[PDB]
């Protein structure tokens, strides 16, 4: 009653391989980033247009920025306000 | 659901878009300041204590209970369902801690040591005298949690109309087999417990939509063959009116129990929850969503969209229209630069005229998405919620000169957030901390500590609870002291020194 | 030759303003303002623009603070304040403050703020510009060694 | 793709299993303190072909610098890869009845650590949060169609 | 009352129907759309959009 290696291991590789699969996650994310980089849907025809809109791309690209001057302009990144005047130093 | 295989498919957003518009007023309205709660007292000796809960219940929740996630669930749950629930309870399930420390000097590996509720795991020495330690602690002083309640784990009665008079609430929830057995339930029960439900609870619609956005719900089923400490069972605790005692009057009493074993069964003295409704209906317990007023409108709006694709796919070909045996066939199918196209007779090629919808369909979408802004009261054009609309002593007219009254009603849902659900949470939350006492924490947080004597709890006769944003107010009370210090000043020069004013 | 009608482009003009609605940014928005999360902040900008579908940026910037970056300097100060490295900290500042990790569960020392860093140092420059005055109205008032020292 | 975690969490404290993998060579694992004896019967590339997940590839894709080459072969003996996994999970290997929170690292059918441990050391973000859930919603999520529409 | 009458004359007249004059147009290659198609007609003024 106190889990030898080989108990663990068992139940550590149950709890893995439920996971690394095909699974409507992994699909949607990795769908995300061939929209992204503006990969070809795959309904091409040898001889038409095969030109892809870019949306997500420009949503992103203009989102980031203002993420990064918040947070980032200042220099200093956190600020640790004490809770009394004894703090102060430590803060 | 009434697509069609080679058709369009296309669904109008409506909901999603009002949603995300409403929210974020809603959190810069009772989040921006830092503050969520301010206790105001009712008479200059009560100060002191107006102080001491200001700073606790904000430690508490915001430090301690992730604040803002609660908000936020609470929040959406309320727009986007009828109504939302929080729950503030006192953690019941003590688990113990394992803690680990290195570089530390004597003093405070003895002042860790000299607890009598901790046990040496691991120490050891390193050069410079520095020290490791690896303990475990079982801690007993309690918790004061804040959870926010999926809807469809929350059972109320069809006659309630309100909280306080329900008849019959309950909260339904998953124990592992670790919890139960720190609750106290006896191994032989344990052995005998139903591992998957009695009343097939684990279907409910809520929860197969949720969790099929991204496919990651129950499609696998657990607490079979895994280890025997994490199986999981479906408990309820019910609070509700039953006569018990036998004195002829029903009380309300708090039944907590798994299975057909009841594991708790005690008379409780306050029911712990706080509801929101957004657009209330008079004398109802469950209010209107944004679905129930729009829906008609996403309904129409992505078939006449549907309508437009459908026109569009199959008038881009490009055809053309040819006499028969007045043009040469041939000629025409090599399209080169500058060919040319021998014909025996003319006005024998043209280009195929395409049917067309008339411009009804695109004023009525115009209309329709007019008639959404209408109705919701937000529009793509209307500005967002001041941080200060709920402010007494505002004054700041903004938002009344602009903020026409169909778009007011904005203002009228941050109102009843603040008037119904919030100031009972904070209500609670006050309660909770004065009823179950727990020195040393307190002072550990500000370094004093005020005695309460919590006997009239139930009359609320000391402190008056605004969960009125504390948003900018700094600058005012600010002010408030340049003009106060030039009083004293004036009073000084008077000649009032250490009779109108002392220098302390 | 046969040409397309302006059904066409039109709905294109119309699924552009339909992602423009949707993400709550456009062409035409304007960026967010570099001290948005500040409390004290005054500055009434972003509430006198930025309309309330576009206000919708302004949500992210606030859920980022609230719930991650707080928990990562939550975290980060409490591995420094666990496994203590002294002679860094000093080497650091030249000075060094003893703190017991004993408690470190409670969290009831600091507050972290991840609410940006950003420009208030004209604010308490003003405000110091304040104090030095109140300081010479005190001292000119006969208040030197009991209201005020020379420290 | 390198972070698991299981389908019931709705958040990271609550989490019942947590996974990072990782690639270590032999000259870490060495440091790390792994006998040698151990080291040569190590699997040399995974035990579950963790290494062609869909987002690994379509990243690696954009400029075909992904792993075209195998590697870890007839190299350097002390450069040769191994895939680590460390798990943060509720387990109860004391035997006490109750499951506590620990810490196991290990490559391959060794345990290299397997310790009680105080804290899950991550954090999270959700751009656009769905209350009770973990994952949230992404652009992609919400502008595919138009994207589509569009091309 | 209003609204309903405006719904029900659009939804019976967005199906894009043609009329087209019998014995003149060869049905087979109207039938068949596809891009840069052909249609062959034996006299003018005969497909057009219904009205």
Same mark, same amino acid.
């Given at each position: 009653?106190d ?8 139940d550590?590789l149950?709890?893995?391989?439920? @996971?690394?699969?095909?699974?409507? #996650?992994? +699909? ?6 061939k929209?992204y980089?503006? =990969? %070809?849907?795959?309904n091409?025809?040898?001889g038409?247009?095969?030109?892809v ?7 992103? @690209?203009?989102?980031?920025?203002? #993420?990064? +001057? ?6 200093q990144?956190?600020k640790? =306000? %004490? ?9 | ?7 369009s498919?296309?669904?109008s957003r ?11 007023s ?12 301010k ?10 204590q ?7 219940v904000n ?25 939302g629930?929080?729950?503030?309870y006192?953690?019941?399930v ?13 003093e ?11 046990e ?5 020495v ?6 490791s330690?690896?303990i ?6 309690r ?14 009665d ?9 008849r ?17 339930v006896?191994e ?15 279907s ?6 949720r ?16 280890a ?9 605790e ?12 029903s ?24 509801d ?27 078939v006449?969209?549907r ?10 070909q ?5 006499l028969?045996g007045?043009?040469?066939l041939e000629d ?12 025996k ?6 280009p195929?005229?395409?049917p ?6 695109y004023?009525?979408?115009d ?7 209408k109705?919701?009261?937000i529009?793509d ?9 709920l ?5 700041a007219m903004?938002?009344?000169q602009?903020?026409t ?12 957030f ?11 939350l ?7 006492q ?24 000391d402190?008056?609870?605004?969960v009125?944003?504390?948003n ?13 210090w ?8 008077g ?10």
């Amino acid at each position: 009653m106190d889990d030898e290696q080989v108990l663990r291991h068992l139940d550590q590789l149950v709890n893995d391989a439920l @996971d690394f699969n095909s699974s409507e #996650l992994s +699909k949607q994310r990795s769908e995300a980033l061939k929209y992204y980089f503006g =990969e %070809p849907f795959g309904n091409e025809r040898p001889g038409k247009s095969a030109i892809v809109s870019r949306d997500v791309q420009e949503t992103v @690209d203009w989102i980031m920025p203002s #993420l990064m +001057k918040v947070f980032t302009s200042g220099g200093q990144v956190v600020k640790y =306000e %004490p809770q009394t005047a004894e703090d102060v130093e430590q803060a | 659901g009434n697509e069609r295989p080679g058709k369009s498919a296309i669904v109008s957003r409506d909901v999603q878009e009002t949603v995300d518009w409403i929210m974020p007023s809603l959190m810069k309205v009772f989040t921006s300041g830092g503050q969520v709660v301010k206790y105001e007292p009712q008479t200059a000796e009560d100060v002191e204590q107006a102080e001491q809960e200001t700073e606790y219940v904000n430690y508490l929740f915001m430090r301690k209970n992730e604040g803002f996630k609660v908000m936020f669930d609470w929040f959406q749950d309320t727009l986007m369902m009828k109504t939302g629930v929080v729950k503030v309870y006192v953690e019941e399930v003590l688990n113990p801690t394992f803690e680990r420390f290195s570089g530390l000097s004597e003093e405070m590996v003895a002042d860790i040591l000299a607890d009598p509720d901790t046990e040496i795991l691991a120490q050891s020495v390193d050069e410079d005298g520095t020290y490791s330690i690896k303990i475990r602690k079982d801690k007993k002083k309690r918790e004061i949690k804040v959870t926010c309640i999926k809807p469809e784990n929350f059972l109320v009665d069809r006659l309630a109309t309100c909280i306080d008079d329900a008849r019959f609430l309950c909260h339904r929830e998953k124990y592992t087999v670790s919890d139960l057995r720190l609750l106290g339930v006896p191994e032989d029960v344990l052995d005998e417990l139903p591992y998957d439900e009695y009343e097939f609870s684990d279907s409910q619609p809520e929860r197969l939509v949720r969790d099929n956005f991204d496919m990651t719900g129950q499609l696998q089923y657990n607490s079979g063959d895994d280890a025997e400490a994490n199986r999981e069972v479906w408990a309820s605790e019910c609070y509700t009116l039953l006569d018990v005692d036998g004195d002829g009057i029903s009380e309300l009493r708090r039944i907590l129990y798994v299975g057909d074993y009841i594991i708790s069964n005690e008379p409780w003295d306050c029911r712990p929850f706080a509801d929101l409704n957004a657009y209330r209906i008079a004398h109802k317990f469950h209010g209107m969503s944004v679905y129930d007023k729009i829906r008609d409108i996403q309904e129409i709006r992505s078939v006449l969209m549907r309508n437009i694709m459908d026109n569009i796919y199959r008038t881009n070909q490009g055809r053309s229209v040819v006499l028969d045996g007045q043009v040469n066939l041939e000629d025409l199918l090599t399209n080169e630069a500058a060919g040319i196209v021998r014909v025996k007779a003319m006005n024998s090629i043209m280009p195929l005229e395409t049917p067309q919808l008339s411009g009804e369909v695109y004023g009525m979408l115009d209309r329709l998405e007019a008639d959404r802004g209408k109705r919701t009261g937000i529009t793509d054009r209307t500005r967002g919620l001041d941080q200060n609309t709920l402010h007494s002593n505002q004054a700041a007219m903004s938002v009344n000169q602009l903020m026409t009254a169909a778009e007011q009603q904005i203002d009228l849902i941050a109102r009843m957030f603040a008037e119904t659900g919030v100031k009972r949470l904070f209500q609670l939350l006050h309660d909770h901390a004065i009823k179950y006492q727990n020195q040393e924490e307190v002072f550990q947080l500000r370094g004093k500590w005020v005695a309460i004597n919590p006997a009239n709890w139930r009359e609320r006769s000391d402190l008056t609870v605004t969960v009125g944003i504390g948003n900018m107010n700094k600058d005012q009370q600010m002010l408030h002291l340049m003009r106060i210090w030039e009083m004293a000043q004036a009073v000084v020069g008077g000649g009032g020194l250490g009779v109108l004013v002392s220098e302390q």
